[PDB]
PDB file of C-alpha atoms and ligand atoms in Angstrom:
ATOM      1  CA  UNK A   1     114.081  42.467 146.371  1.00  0.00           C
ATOM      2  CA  UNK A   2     110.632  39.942 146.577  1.00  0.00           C
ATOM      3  CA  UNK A   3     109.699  37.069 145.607  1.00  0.00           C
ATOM      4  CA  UNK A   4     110.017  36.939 142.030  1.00  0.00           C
ATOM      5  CA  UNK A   5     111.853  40.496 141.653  1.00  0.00           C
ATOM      6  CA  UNK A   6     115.435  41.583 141.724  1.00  0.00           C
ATOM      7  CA  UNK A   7     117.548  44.404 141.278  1.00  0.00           C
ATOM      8  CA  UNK A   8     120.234  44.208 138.175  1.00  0.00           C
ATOM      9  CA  UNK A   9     122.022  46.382 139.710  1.00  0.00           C
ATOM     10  CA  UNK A  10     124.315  48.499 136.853  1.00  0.00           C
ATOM     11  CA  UNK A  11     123.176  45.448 134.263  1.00  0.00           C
ATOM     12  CA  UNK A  12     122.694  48.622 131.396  1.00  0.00           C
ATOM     13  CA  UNK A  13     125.387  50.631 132.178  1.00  0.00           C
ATOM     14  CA  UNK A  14     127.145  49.060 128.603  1.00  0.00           C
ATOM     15  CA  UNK A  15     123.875  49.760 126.602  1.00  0.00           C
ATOM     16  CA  UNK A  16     123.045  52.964 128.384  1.00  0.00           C
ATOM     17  CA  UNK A  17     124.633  55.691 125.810  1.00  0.00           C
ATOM     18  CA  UNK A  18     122.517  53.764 123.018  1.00  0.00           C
ATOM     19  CA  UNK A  19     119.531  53.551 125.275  1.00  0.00           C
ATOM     20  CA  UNK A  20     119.807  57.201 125.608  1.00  0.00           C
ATOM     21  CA  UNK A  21     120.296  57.574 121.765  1.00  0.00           C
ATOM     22  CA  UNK A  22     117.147  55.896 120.499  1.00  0.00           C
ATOM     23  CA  UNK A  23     115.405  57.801 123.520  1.00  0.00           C
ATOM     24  CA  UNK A  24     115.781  60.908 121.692  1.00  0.00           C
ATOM     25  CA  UNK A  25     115.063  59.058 118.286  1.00  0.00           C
ATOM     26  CA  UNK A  26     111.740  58.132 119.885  1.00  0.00           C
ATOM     27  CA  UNK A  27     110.949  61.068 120.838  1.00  0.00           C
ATOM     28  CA  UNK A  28     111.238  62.794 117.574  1.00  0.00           C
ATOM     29  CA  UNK A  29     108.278  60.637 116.233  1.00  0.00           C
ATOM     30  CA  UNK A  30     106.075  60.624 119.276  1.00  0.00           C
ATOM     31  CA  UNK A  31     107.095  63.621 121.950  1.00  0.00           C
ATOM     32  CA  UNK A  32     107.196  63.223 125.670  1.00  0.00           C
ATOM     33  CA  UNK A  33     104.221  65.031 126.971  1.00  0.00           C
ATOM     34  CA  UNK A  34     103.347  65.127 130.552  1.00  0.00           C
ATOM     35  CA  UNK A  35      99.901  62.864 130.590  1.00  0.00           C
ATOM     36  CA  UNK A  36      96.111  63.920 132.329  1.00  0.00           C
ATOM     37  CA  UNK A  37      95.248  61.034 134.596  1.00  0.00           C
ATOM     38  CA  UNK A  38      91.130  60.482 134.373  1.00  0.00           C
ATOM     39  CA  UNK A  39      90.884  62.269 136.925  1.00  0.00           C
ATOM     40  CA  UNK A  40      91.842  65.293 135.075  1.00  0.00           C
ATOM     41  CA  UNK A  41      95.168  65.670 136.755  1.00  0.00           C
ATOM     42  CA  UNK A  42      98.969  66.451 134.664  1.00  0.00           C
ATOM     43  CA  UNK A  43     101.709  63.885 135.800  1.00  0.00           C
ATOM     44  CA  UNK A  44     104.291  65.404 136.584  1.00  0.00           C
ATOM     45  CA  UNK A  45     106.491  62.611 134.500  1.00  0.00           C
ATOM     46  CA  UNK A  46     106.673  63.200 130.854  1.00  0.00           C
ATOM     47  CA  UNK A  47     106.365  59.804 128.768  1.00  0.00           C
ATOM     48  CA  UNK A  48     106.327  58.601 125.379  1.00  0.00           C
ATOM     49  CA  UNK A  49     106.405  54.875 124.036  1.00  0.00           C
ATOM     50  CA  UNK A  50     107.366  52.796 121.715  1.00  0.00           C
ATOM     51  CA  UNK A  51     106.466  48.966 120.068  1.00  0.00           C
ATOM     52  CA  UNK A  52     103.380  48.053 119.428  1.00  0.00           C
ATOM     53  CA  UNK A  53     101.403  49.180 121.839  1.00  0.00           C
ATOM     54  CA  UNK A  54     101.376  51.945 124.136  1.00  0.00           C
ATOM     55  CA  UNK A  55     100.319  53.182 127.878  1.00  0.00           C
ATOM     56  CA  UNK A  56      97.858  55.890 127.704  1.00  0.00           C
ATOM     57  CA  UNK A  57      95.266  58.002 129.760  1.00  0.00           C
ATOM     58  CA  UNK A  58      91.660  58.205 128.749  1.00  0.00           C
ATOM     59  CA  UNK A  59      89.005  60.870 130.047  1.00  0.00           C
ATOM     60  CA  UNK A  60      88.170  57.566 132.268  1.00  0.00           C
ATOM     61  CA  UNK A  61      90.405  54.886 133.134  1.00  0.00           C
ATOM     62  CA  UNK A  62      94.165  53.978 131.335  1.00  0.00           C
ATOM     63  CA  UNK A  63      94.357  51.439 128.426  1.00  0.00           C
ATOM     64  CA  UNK A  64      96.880  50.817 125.653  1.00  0.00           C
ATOM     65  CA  UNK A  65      96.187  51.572 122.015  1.00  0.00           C
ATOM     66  CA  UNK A  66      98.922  50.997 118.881  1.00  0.00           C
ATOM     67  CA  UNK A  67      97.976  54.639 118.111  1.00  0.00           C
ATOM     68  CA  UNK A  68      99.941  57.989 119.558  1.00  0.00           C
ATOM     69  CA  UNK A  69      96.911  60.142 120.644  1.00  0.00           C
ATOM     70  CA  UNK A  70      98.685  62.915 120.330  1.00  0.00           C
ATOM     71  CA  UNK A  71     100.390  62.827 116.944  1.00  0.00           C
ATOM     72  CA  UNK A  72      97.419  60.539 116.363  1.00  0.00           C
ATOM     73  CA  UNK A  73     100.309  58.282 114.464  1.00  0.00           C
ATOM     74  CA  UNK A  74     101.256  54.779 115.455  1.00  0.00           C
ATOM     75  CA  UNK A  75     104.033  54.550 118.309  1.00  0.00           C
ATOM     76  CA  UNK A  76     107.451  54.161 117.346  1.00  0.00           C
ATOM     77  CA  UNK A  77     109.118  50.676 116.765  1.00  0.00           C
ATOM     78  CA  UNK A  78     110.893  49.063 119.309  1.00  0.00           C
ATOM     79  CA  UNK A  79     114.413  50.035 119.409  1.00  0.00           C
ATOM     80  CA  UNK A  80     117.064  47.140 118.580  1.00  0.00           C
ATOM     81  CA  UNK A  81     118.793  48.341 121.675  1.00  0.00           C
ATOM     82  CA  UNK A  82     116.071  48.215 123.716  1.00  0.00           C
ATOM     83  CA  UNK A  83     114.744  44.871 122.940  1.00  0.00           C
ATOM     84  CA  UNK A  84     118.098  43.551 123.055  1.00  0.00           C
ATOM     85  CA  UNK A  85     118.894  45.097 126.664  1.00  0.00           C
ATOM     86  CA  UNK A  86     115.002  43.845 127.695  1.00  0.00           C
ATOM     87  CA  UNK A  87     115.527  40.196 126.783  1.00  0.00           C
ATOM     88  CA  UNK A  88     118.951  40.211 128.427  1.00  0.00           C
ATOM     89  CA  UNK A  89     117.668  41.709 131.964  1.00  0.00           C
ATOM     90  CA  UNK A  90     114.474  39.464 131.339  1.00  0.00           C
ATOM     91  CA  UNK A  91     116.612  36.268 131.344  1.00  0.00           C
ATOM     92  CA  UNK A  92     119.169  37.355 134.010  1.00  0.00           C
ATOM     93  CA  UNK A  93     116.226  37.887 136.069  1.00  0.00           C
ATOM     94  CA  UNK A  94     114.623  34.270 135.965  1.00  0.00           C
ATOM     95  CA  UNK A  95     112.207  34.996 132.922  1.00  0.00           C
ATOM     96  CA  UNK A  96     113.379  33.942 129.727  1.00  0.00           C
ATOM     97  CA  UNK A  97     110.901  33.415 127.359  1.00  0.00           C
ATOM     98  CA  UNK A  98     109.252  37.336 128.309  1.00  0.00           C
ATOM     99  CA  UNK A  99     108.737  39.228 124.351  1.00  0.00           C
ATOM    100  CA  UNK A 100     107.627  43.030 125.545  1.00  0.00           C
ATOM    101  CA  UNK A 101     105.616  44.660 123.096  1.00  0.00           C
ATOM    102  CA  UNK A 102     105.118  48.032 124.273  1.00  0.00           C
ATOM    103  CA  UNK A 103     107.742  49.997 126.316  1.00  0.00           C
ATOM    104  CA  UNK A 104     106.810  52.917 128.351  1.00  0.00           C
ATOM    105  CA  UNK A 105     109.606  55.664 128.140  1.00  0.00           C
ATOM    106  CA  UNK A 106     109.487  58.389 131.769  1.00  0.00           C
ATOM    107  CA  UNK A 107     110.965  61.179 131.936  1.00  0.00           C
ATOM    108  CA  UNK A 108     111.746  63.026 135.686  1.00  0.00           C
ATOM    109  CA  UNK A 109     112.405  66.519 135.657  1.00  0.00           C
ATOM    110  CA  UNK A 110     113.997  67.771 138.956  1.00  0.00           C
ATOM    111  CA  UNK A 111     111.231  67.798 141.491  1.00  0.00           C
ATOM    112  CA  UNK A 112     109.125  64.991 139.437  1.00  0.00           C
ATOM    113  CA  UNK A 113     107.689  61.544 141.005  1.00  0.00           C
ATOM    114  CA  UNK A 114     105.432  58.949 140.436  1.00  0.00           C
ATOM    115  CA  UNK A 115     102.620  58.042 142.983  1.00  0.00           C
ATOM    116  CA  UNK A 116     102.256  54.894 144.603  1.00  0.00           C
ATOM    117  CA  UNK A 117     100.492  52.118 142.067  1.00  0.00           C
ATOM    118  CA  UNK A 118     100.030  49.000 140.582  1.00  0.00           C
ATOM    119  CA  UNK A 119     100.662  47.544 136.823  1.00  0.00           C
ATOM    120  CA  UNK A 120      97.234  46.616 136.179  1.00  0.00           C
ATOM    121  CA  UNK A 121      96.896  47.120 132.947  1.00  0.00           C
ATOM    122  CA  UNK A 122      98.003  44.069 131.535  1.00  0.00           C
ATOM    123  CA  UNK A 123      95.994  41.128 131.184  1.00  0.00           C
ATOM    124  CA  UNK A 124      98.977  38.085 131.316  1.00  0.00           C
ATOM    125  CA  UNK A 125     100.353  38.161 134.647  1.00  0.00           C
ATOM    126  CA  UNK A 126     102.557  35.532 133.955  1.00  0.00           C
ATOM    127  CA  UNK A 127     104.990  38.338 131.844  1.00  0.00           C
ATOM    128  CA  UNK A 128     107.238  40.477 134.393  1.00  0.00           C
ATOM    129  CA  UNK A 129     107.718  44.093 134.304  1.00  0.00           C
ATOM    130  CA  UNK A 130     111.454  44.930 133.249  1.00  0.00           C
ATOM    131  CA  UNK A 131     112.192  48.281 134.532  1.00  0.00           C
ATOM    132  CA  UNK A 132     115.232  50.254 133.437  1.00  0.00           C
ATOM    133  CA  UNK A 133     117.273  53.307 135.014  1.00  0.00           C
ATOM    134  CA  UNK A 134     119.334  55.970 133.167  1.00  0.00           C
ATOM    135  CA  UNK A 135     120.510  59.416 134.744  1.00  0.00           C
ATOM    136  CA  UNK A 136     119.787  61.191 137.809  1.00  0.00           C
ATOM    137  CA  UNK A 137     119.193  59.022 141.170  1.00  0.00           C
ATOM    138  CA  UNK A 138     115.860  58.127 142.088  1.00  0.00           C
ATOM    139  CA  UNK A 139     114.367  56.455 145.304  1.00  0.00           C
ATOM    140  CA  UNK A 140     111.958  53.647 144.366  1.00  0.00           C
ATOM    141  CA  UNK A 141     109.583  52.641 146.766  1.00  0.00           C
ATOM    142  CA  UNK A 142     108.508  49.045 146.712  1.00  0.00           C
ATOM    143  CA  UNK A 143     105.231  47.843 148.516  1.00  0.00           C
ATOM    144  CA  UNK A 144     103.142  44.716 148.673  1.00  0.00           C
ATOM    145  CA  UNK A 145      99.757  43.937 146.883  1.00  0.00           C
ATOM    146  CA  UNK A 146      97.754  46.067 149.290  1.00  0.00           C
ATOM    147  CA  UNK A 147      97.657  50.095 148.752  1.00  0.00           C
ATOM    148  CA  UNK A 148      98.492  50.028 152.753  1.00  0.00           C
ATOM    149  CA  UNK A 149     101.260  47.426 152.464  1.00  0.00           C
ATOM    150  CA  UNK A 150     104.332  48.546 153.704  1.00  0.00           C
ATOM    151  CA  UNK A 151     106.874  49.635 151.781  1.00  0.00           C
ATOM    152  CA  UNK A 152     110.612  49.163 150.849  1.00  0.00           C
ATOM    153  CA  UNK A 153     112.959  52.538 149.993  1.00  0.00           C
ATOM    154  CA  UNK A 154     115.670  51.373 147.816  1.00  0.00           C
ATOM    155  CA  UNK A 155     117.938  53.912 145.533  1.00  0.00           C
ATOM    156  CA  UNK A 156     117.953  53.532 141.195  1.00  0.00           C
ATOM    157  CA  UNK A 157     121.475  54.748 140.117  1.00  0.00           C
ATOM    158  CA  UNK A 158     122.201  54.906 136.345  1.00  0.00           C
ATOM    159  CA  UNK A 159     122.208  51.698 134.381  1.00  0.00           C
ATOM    160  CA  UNK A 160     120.248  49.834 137.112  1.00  0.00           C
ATOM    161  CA  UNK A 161     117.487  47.241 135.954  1.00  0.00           C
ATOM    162  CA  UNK A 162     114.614  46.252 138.315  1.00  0.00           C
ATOM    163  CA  UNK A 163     112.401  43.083 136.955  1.00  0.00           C
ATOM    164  CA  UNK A 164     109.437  42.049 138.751  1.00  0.00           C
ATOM    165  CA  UNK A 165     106.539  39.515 138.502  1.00  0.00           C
ATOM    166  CA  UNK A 166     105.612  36.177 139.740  1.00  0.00           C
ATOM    167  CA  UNK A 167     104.816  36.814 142.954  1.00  0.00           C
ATOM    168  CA  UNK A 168     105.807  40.556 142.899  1.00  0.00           C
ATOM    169  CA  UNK A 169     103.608  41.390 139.950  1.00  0.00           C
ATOM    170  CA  UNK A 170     101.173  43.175 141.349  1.00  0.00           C
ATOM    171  CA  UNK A 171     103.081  44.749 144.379  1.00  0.00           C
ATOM    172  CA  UNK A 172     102.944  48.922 144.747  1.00  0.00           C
ATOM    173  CA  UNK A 173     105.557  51.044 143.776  1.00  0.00           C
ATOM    174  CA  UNK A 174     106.476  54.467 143.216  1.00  0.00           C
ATOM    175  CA  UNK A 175     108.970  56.965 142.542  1.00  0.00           C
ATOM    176  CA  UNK A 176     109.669  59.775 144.682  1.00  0.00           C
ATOM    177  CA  UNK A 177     110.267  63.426 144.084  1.00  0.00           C
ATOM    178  CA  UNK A 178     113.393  62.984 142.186  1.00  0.00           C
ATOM    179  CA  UNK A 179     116.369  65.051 143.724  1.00  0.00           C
ATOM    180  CA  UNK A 180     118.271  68.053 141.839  1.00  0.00           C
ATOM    181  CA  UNK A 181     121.502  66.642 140.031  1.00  0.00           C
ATOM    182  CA  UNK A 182     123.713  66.490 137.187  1.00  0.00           C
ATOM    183  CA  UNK A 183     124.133  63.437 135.079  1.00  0.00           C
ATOM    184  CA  UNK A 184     126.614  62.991 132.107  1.00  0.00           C
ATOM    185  CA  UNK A 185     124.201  61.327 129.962  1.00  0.00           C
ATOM    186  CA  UNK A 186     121.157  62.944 130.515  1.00  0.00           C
ATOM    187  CA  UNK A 187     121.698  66.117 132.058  1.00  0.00           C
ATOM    188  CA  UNK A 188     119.476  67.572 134.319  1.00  0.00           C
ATOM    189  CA  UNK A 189     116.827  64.350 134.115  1.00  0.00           C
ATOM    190  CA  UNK A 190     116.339  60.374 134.892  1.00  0.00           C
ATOM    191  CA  UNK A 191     114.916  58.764 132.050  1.00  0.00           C
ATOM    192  CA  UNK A 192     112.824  54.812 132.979  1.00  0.00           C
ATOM    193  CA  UNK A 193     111.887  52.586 130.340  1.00  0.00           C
ATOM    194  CA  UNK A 194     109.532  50.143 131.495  1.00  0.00           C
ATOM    195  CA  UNK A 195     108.917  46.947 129.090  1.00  0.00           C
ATOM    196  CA  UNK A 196     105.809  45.485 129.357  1.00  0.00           C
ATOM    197  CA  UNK A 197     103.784  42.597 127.554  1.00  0.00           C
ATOM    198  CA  UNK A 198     100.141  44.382 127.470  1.00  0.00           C
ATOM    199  CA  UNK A 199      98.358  42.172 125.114  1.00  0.00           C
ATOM    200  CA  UNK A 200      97.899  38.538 124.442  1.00  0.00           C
TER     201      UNK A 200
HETATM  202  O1  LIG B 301     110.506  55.188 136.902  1.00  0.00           O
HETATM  203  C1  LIG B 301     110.395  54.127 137.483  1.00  0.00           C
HETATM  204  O2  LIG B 301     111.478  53.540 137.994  1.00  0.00           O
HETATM  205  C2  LIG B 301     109.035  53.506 137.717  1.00  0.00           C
HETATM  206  C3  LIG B 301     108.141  53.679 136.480  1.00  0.00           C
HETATM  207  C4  LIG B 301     106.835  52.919 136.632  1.00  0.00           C
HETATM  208  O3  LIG B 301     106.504  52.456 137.704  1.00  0.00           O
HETATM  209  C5  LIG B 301     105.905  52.800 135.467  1.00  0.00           C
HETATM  210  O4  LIG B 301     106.207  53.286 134.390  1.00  0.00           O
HETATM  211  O5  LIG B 301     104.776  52.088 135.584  1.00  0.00           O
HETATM  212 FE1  LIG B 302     104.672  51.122 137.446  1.00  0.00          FE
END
């Protein structure tokens, strides 16, 4: 895909129906809710995590915190099933000493998409960004390190696994408006769960 990033293409199709599973378990502690950016705008992607810390939107700027600012309870714990699937991809993917601790759980709704940006919200660069697939289609667009940078179109099918860093850390991406459909597993959505090491 880039230097230092690769597509695991299928790689979670096995774990998928668990994935799924502790999704929804998840979600009964801390709820997807569709975010404000600082800007004051709502994504359109409805997220949740879970570990020790998670991805959040302030009145200025995005930071992580161990505490759910909306149930205003810590995040869920990691998932065995998703730690296990993480460390798996991780290592199939050239990094095998990466521990996650926080995993960002999206949620696309027919119609939903995720603008153009950068993980820059992690201080160690050196840990990759292991990004799993589950549902509907989506078309993930992969850039360079400049907001300008052109960009790669390349499709995310159920089960697929996308792992980035090195080189590729910082490159743009995005998710475009993701196309009506039917899915098995998750019905009318496509659910991403994006393992990240935020803090030291
Ligand atoms: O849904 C995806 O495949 C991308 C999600 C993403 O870029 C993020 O959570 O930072
Ligand atoms: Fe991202």
């Amino acid at each position: 895909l880039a230097a230092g990033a690769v597509i695991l293409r299928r790689f979670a199709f096995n774990a998928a129906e668990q994935l799924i599973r502790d999704i929804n378990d998840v979600a009964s502690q801390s709820p997807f809710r569709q975010m404000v950016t600082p800007g004051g705008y709502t994504m359109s992607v409805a997220m949740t995590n879970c570990g020790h810390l998670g991805w959040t939107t302030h009145r200025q700027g995005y930071l992580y915190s161990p505490i759910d600012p909306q149930t205003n309870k810590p995040w869920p714990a990691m998932p065995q099933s998703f730690h296990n699937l993480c460390q798996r991809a991780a290592t199939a993917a050239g990094y095998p000493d990466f521990q996650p601790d926080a995993c960002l759980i999206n949620r696309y709704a027919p119609g939903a998409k995720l603008s153009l940006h950068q993980d820059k919200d992690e201080p160690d660069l050196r840990a990759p960004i292991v990004s799993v697939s589950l549902g509907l289609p989506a078309i993930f667009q992969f850039g360079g390190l400049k907001r300008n940078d052109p960009l790669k179109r390349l499709l995310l099918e159920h089960g697929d696994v996308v792992v980035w860093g090195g080189e590729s850390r910082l490159f743009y991406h995005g998710i475009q408006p993701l196309k009506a459909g039917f899915h098995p597993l998750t019905i009318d959505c496509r659910y991403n769960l994006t393992f990240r090491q935020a803090g030291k």
